[PDB]
Amino acid sequence: FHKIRNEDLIFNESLGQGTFTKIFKGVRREVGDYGQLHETEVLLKVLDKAHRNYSESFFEAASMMSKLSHKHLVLNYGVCVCGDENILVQEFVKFGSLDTYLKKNKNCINILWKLEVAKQLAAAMHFLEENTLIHGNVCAKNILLIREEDRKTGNPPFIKLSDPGISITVLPKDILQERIPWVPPECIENPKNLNLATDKWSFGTTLWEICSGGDKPLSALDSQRKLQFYEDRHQLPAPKAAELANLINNCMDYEPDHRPSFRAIIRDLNSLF
Numbered sequence: 368f369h370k371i372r373n374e375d376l377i378f379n380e381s382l383g384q385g386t387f388t389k390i391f392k393g394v395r396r397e398v399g400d401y402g403q404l405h406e407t408e409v410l411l412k413v414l415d416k417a418h419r420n421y422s423e424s425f426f427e428a429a430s431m432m433s434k435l436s437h438k439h440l441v442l443n444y445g446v447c448v449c450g451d452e453n454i455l456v457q458e459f460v461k462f463g464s465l466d467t468y469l470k471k472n473k474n475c476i477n478i479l480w481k482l483e484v485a486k487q488l489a490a491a492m493h494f495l496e497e498n499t500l501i502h503g504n505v506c507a508k509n510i511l512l513i514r515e516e517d518r519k520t521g522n523p524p525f526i527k528l529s530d531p532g533i534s535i536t537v538l539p540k541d542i543l544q545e546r547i548p549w550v551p552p553e554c555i556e557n558p559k560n561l562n563l564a565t566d567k568w569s570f571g572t573t574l575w576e577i578c579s580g581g582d583k584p585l586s587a588l589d590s591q592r593k594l595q596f597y598e599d600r601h602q603l604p605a606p607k608a609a610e611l612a613n614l615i616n617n618c619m620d621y622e623p624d625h626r627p628s629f630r631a632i633i634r635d636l637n638s639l640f
């Protein structure tokens with residue numbers, strides 16, 4: 368990881384919170400190409416001091432995204448570990464998380480937009496699968512919109528997948544249960560069951576999000592009822608825009624070995640026209 372000096376980073380507005388983290392917009396003063404000075408917008412993720420013990424895992428997640436380079440993976444600029452703070456310095460994606468964007472723009476997003484975003488996410492996951500790299504936290508909040516659809520010039524939307532944050536393999540059980548139904552059943556049974564099939568399940572849940580205008584599946588269920596939801600082997604209801612319901616249910620297979628490869632998922636996606 369490239370170590371960035373605290374002097375070169377300026378914290379600005381809070382954008383929200385992750386698990387044991389606070390997230391801010393910031394500015395990084397840097398020497399760019401040809402020696403030109405730039406003040407670059409950045410995303411600053413800060414681990415809560417009270418959870419400093421997760422630091423390793425906190426950085427491990429980010430490490431996963433920087434091992435490979437891909438057009439659909441958010442860039443990591445480096446880390447600031449100056450002092451007692453642990454800071455991730457990442458690319459600032461203009462339009463932010465996809466779930467917020469869907470909730471705000473639901474009244475003007477059709478099937479073609481959803482299908483393009485789904486294809487891009489599936490392509491990112493196919494890249495990860497071919498590299499045998501587990502993401503571990505696919506969800507609409509971790510999809511970021513680089514640019515919007517422009518029907519005037521035919522441009523499709525473009526998305527990037529963000530880093531997964533602290534791994535579910537080390538998170539407390541109640542956080543895992545709160546993350547049903549993104550966390551697959553076998554990881555609720557044993558968090559060390561984290562596997563490639565995990566991301567296929569979570570991809571199904573994320574498709575449900577994309578199709579549901581930013582609604583959160585099973586949000587009306589508390590943790591005990593989410594557990595019970597997995598115990599009775601229920602599936603998510605089809606979204607009112609049901610064009611992807613079969614794909615969602617095929618990915619959210621209670622048998623991890625039966626979840627389809629992302630190549631087959633991409634084939635299915637392309638078959639809808």
Ligand SMILES: Fc1cc(-c2cccc3ncc(-c4cnn(C5CCNCC5)c4)nc23)cc(F)c1CN1CCOCC1
Pocket residue numbers: 382383384385390410441457458459460461462463464466467508509511529
């Ligand atoms: F606060 C968060 C930040 C990210 C995130 C991770 C990695 C890179 C990111 N780049 C930009 C933005 C971002 C945030 N807002 N905006 C603009 C859009 C509208 N104008 C203001 C800025 C851009 N967010 C990024 C992911 C999250 F998961 C949350 C946590 N939450 C996710 C759901 O929404 C609330 C925050």
